Structure 1
Amino acid sequence: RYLMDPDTFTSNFNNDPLVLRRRQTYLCYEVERLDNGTSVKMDQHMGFLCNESGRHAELRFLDLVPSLQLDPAQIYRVTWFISWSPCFSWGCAGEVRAFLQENTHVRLRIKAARIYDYDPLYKEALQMLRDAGAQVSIMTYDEFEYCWDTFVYRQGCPFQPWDGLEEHSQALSGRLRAILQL
């Protein structure tokens, strides 16, 4: 499988509000099948995506779900490690909602590096995802390092954190939890 350039990862998954990266999203994904509380990790179905020519990464993920040949009689958990929380105003939250309503064999876990509050309706996007059944949280050091180790062409080099990672993660987490309080 194809591993991401390290500079692409660091520039995009950074959670420092002073680092600008509003033009692009990277979305790393994995899939597991849930068999009576037992997890079947399906490494054949892992990868990453970015926005391309006006189509947001999230919709590009939905586009490839058919190619995963999921068995609708089974249950799968999709996990997204996404550099921005999904938008509302350009359709991602609504498409994910509609996808999950039609594909009840899929559960979705979303771990976001930053909140995409450039969208005036970003709170509505987060709440729509929650209420469609998606579990939304903010990426922590643990998840940043996991993504580095899993999706990045790192050549054995360890994850090197940017300054303030933990502080920014906790601040975003407080914001997200207040938005999703329920």
Structure 2
Amino acid sequence: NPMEAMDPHIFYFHFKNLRKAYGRNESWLCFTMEVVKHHSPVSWKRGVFRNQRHAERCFLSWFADDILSPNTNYEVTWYTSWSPCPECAGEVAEFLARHSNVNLTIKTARLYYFDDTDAAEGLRSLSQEGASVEIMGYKDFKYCWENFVYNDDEPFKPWDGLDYNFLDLDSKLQEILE
């Protein structure tokens, strides 16, 4: 179901942190995962998810059906193009509350297009369930380029406005969470 990496043009298009930019009708989810008991990690998995159900649900389906074992722990990290929608966000926090051997860190390139108060709550329900929510910065984009993109060993070229858009996004995110 999931992919290993994505085409460089899909990365630069869906992961540009232009807070308000339509054309991104899909939601992409880069993930990395560490499976571990009570010592060091005994395995790991990374990959990419696209919308085809949202990309969030395509993860939880694949994850539960193929990976989740009751006597093992999971350190999951998400890099999403759009921040998770209210419906998926609630279904993740419900998963998080029932599965304590899973910890999630969500980094998003963007929040939402409109100021939906609905969406700010799902982002809060997530945080209340122990999940870590943050806005992707230069280092996160750089990390996704090197790990989830067929980059052909080309450097990550940051776009104009990266830091400025992240700054406006991290501001709005912090107000949501507190």
Q: Same fold (TM over 0.5)?
A: yes
Which residue of structure 2 aligns with residue 142 of structure 1? 139
Give the equivalent residue in structure 1 for 2:25.
Answer: 23
Q: 1:13-38 CA distances to partner (integer Å, 9 max, x unpaired)?
A: 000135324411110001113555x6
- Tell me how far 1:39 sits from its aligned partner: 5.1
- Return the letter of the residue paired with 2:48: F
Equivalents in 2 of 1:143, 1:11: separation in Å?
A: 16
Distance 1:158 1:3 in 2: 16
Show structure 1 runs of 5+ residues with no match: none
Q: Which residue of 1 aligns with 2:13?
A: 11
In 2, the alpha carbon distance for the partners of 1:179 and 1:130 equals: 11
Counting matched residue pairs gives 175
Q: Which residue of 2 aligns with 1:85?
A: 83
TM-fit CA distance, 1:74: 2.6
Stretches of 4+ moved more than 6 A in 1?
A: none
2:58 maps to what in 1? 60
Aligned residue in 2 for 1:76: 74
Question: Structure 1 residues 113 and 42 mapped into 2: Cα distance closer, same or farther (>3 Å)?
Answer: farther
1:128-167 equivalences under 5 Å are 128-167=125-164
Q: Report the TM-score when normalising by structure 2.
A: 0.90
Contact 1:97 1:128 in 2 (8 A): yes
Task: Determine the structure 2 residue equivalent to 1:47.
Answer: 47
Query: CA 1:20–1:146 in structure 2 vs 1: closer, same or farther (change >3 Å)?
Result: same
Task: Return closer, same or farther for 1:107/1:163 CA change in 2, 3 Å cut-off.
Answer: same
Q: RMSD across aligned C-alpha pairs, in angstroms? A: 1.9
The alignment-based identity, stated in percent, is 41
1:119 deviates by: 6.9
Render the CA deviation track for 1:31-60: whole Å, top value 9, x for unaligned: 113555x652744x21111111xx110011
CA distance, structure 1, for counterparts of residue 61 and residue 115 of structure 2: 23
- Residues 130-166 of structure 1 show CA distances to partners (whole Å, capped at 9, x for unaligned) of 1121100000100000000000011010000110101
Any unmatched runs of 5+ in structure 2?
A: none
User: Structure 2 vs 1, CA of residues 178 and 69 (structure 1 numbering), >3 Å: closer, same or farther?
Assistant: same
8 Å contact kept, 1:32–1:39: no
Q: Contact between 1:87 and 1:119, CA under 8 Å: does it hold in 2? A: no
For residues 78-114 of structure 1, give each alpha carbon's deviation from its aligned partner in whole angstroms, at most 9, with x where no partner exists: 10011111111xx201110111112111011000000
Matches within 5 A, 1:105-124: 105-118=101-114, 120=116, 121-124=118-121
8 Å contact from structure 1 (residues 72, 105) kept in 2: yes
Q: Counterpart in 2 of 1:169?
A: 166
Report the 3-state secondary structure (helix = DSSP H, G, I; strand = E; otherwise coil) of the residue aligned with 1:46: strand
